[PDB]
Amino acid sequence: PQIKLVLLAGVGFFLDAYDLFIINQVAPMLAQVYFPKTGLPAQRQDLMKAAANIGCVVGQVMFGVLGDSFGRKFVYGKELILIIVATIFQMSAPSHWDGNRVLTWITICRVFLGIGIGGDAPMSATVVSDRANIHRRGTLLCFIFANQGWGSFVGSLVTIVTISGFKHRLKSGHTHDVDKAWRILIGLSLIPAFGTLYQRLTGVIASKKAHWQEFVAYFSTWNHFRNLLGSMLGWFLVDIAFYGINLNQSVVLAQIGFAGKTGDVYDKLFQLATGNIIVTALGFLPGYYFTLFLIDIVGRKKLQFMGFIMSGLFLAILAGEIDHIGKGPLLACFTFMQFFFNFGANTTTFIVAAELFPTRIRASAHGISAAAGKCGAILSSLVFNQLKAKIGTSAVLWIFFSTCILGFISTFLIDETMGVDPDEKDLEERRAR
Numbered sequence: 001p002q003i004k005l006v007l008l009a010g011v012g013f014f015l016d017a018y019d020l021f022i023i024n025q026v027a028p029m030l031a032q033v034y035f036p037k038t039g040l041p042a043q044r045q046d047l048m049k050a051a052a053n054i055g056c057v058v059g060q061v062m063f064g065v066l067g068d069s070f071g072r073k074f075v076y077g078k079e080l081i082l083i084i085v086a087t088i089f090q091m092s093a094p095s096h097w098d099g100n101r102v103l104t105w106i107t108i109c110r111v112f113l114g115i116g117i118g119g120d121a122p123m124s125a126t127v128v129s130d131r132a133n134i135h136r137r138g139t140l141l142c143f144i145f146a147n148q149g150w151g152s153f154v155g156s157l158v159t160i161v162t163i164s165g166f167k168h169r170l171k172s173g174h175t176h177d178v179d180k181a182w183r184i185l186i187g188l189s190l191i192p193a194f195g196t197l198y199q200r201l202t203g204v205i206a207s208k209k210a211h212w213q214e215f216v217a218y219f220s221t222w223n224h225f226r227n228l229l230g231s232m233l234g235w236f237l238v239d240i241a242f243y244g245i246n247l248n249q250s251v252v253l254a255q256i257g258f259a260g261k262t263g264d265v266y267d268k269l270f271q272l273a274t275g276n277i278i279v280t281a282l283g284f285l286p287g288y289y290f291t292l293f294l295i296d297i298v299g300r301k302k303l304q305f306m307g308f309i310m311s312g313l314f315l316a317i318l319a320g321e322i323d324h325i326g327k328g329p330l331l332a333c334f335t336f337m338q339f340f341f342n343f344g345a346n347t348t349t350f351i352v353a354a355e356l357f358p359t360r361i362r363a364s365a366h367g368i369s370a371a372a373g374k375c376g377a378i379l380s381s382l383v384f385n386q387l388k389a390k391i392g393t394s395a396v397l398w399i400f401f402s403t404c405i406l407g408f409i410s411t412f413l414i415d416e417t418m419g420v421d422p423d424e425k426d427l428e429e430r431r432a433r
Contacts, residue, residue: 002131005127006128006140006143006144008196008199008200009120009124009127009128009144010143010144010147011147011192011196012120012124012147012196013121013124013144013145013147013148013151014147014148014150014151014154014192015083015151015189015192015193015196016083016117016120016121016148016151017147017148017149017150017151017152018150018151018152018154018155018189018192019052019083019087019113019117019151019186019189020052020053020056020117020151020247021151021152021155021246021247022155022185022186022189023048023049023052023110023247024049024155024246024247024248024249024250024276025155025156025158025159025185025250025273025276026182026185026186027040027045027048027049027250028250028269028272029178029179029181029182029185029269030102030103030106030182032175032178032265032268032269033099033176033178033179033182034098034099034102034103035099040103040385041100041103042385042386042388042389043386044100044103044104044107045103045385046381046382046383046384046385046386047107047382048103048106048107048110049247049248049381049384050247050377050378050381050382051107051108051110051111051113051114052110052111052113052114052117053114053243053247053374053377053378053381054111054114054378054382055110055111055112055113055114055115055116055117055118056114056115056117056118056121056374056377057114057118057371057374057375057378058111058114058115058118059079059114059115059116059117059118059119059121060118060119060121060122060367060370060371061118061371062115062118063075063079063115063118063119063123064122064367067123069204072123075119075123076200077197077200077201078119079116079119079120080116080119080120080193080196080197080200081116081197082112082113082115082116082119083112083113083116083117083193084190084193084194084197085112086109086110086112086113086116087109087113087186087187087189087190087193088190089105089109090105090106090109090110090113090186091183091186091187092183093105093106093183095179121370122366122367122370124144125141125350125353125354125366125370126354126362126363126366128140128141128144129141129354129355129362130359130362133421135296135418135419136296137355138295138296138300138351138355138417138418139292139295139296141350141351141354141355142288142291142292142295142347142351143292145288145347145350145351146288146289146292146347148288148342149280149284149285149286149287149288149342150285152246152280152284152285153277153280153281153284153285155185156273156276156277156280156281157277158185158188159185159273159276159277160270160273160274160277162181162184162185163181163266163269163270163273164270166178166181166266167266167270170264170265170266171264171266175265178265178269211364214360214361215361215364218361219365226413227356227357227413227414227415228356228357228365228368228369229410229413230352230410230411230412230413230414231349231352231353231356231357231365231369231372231414232368232369232372233372233406233407233410233413234304234308234345234348234349234352234407234410234411234414235349235350235353235369235370235372235373235376236372236373236375236376237308237345237376237403237404237406237407237410238307238308238341238345238346238349238373238376238403238404238407239346239373239374239375239376239377239380240376240377240379240380240400240403241311241315241341241380241400241403241404242341242345242346242377243376243377243378243380243381244377244380244381244384244400245337245338245341245400246284246338246341247381247384248384248385249276249279249280249338250272250275250276251384251385251388252334252393253272253275253276253279253334254272255322255330255393256275256322256327256330256331256334257326257327257328257330257331258271258272258274258275258327259272275331278331278335279331279334279335279338280338282335282339283334283335283336283337283338283339284338284339284341284342285342286339286342286343287338287339287340287341287342287343287344287346287347288342288343288347290339290342290343291303291342291343291344291347291348295347295348295351295418296418296419298418299416299417299418300348300351300352300355300414300416300417300418301352301411301414301416303343303344303347303348304344304345304348304349304352304407304408304411304414305408305411306340306343306344307340307341307343307344307345307346307347307348308344308345308404308405308407308408308411309404309405309408310336310340310344311337311340311341311344311345311404312401312404312405312408314333314334314336314337314340315337315397315398315400315401315404316397316398316401317333318330318333318334318337318394318397319394319395319396319397319398319401320394322393322394322397323394345404345407349369349373351417352414352417353365353366353369353370354366355417355420355422356414356415356417356422357422358422358423358425358426359422359423360423360426362422376403380400384396387399
């Protein structure tokens with residue numbers, strides 16, 4: 001039936017999300033092995049975590065040109081093999097290498113990993129928005145998007161299970177085994193990756209100039225232009241705070257009480273992995289499902305309004321009190337923030353970008369909106385840890401706070417897409433003139 005296809009898109013997001021966010025769990029292990037006395041260099045750590053998102057935009061533009069040039073039959077399979085190969089090279093960095101050399105190895109591998117993740121990322125949003133043409137299209141988009149939380153959550157679950165498995169061996173003095181652990185975290189993505197591969201198998205310039213003319217003509221009108229503007233802005237702005245935080249979630253939990261001076265190698269990794277699972281299980285994951293049950297009841301805009309404005313509140317509390325109050329209060333606010341990312345702007349910006357635009361342009365308008373988001377992701381990803389040292393963590397959180405208020409303001413540019421057919425609205429718009 002039609003059902004089996006959306007799960008295949010879902011597991012695509014799950015694998016992409018797992019591979020994207022698992023870098024947050026792998027980074028502290030690389031530190032313990034290759035930089036035990038000092039932290040990971042700021043510029044090098046930022047590059048490694050942005051690498052996947054940098055490739056992510058290169059992927060959907062490259063797989064877009066090839067996909068338009070020679071059709072879909074060309075791109076469907078090869079995107080998944082690229083992230084599989086990138087996983088293996090990333091997995092098998094020579095353990096005898098220098099710390100900086102190992103880092104440079106992983107950054108390059110993750111760029112190619114991003115190129116593949118950039119492939120299936122945008123092509124699945126269209127398969128269920130064009131097919132449904134029903135009021136229950138949002139609940140379908142949100143269900144597939146919810147796999148992003150499972151990717152982040154399963155990665156956190158995998159980490160505590162792995163660390164607790166190395167408990168006795170680490171306590172018995174075999175501290176280098178953490179170098180094996182971080183390779184296991186990346187490698188375990190291969191199990192669904194290989195499973196899905198088997199299931200997936202078992203006048204060009206004149207046309208481009210013509211579509212460009214329609215695109216330019218369409219978005220040269222105000223009431224149509226601002227819908228593209230708000231779609232790009234909302235996605236760009238949320239991804240700054242969203243990916244800046246989620247790719248560095250383990251770094252924030254270090255200002256909070258989860259990083260101490262007591263205890264040995266295991267105690268540190270386990271409590272830090274304990275914090276990561278708490279946040280993603282209690283906040284990051286359920287946010288997708290609160291969005292799921294209310295988008296087709298409350299509407300997309302009101303959820304973006306709430307999503308932007310709620311996560312902003314918790315960002316301001318962090319920045320103001322992070323250096324002044326205890327662990328407990330800070331942890332709760334951080335989890336609430338993550339909750340209102342996915343119960344709010346993060347999920348709705350993805351949905352709104354796919355729901356606003358008539359199909360005759362939807363491929364471009366959604367692609368530019370998704371590209372705009374990845375631009376926000378790479379900005380914070382590329383500079384988060386560098387700013388953290390130059391201006392401090394509180395100052396950086398005040399920046400993310402400002403981006404949320406701007407997202408709230410920009411959301412007014414959007415038409416409510418709950419229950420509206422963008423093709424029918426375009427159709428009635430035209431008969432009236």
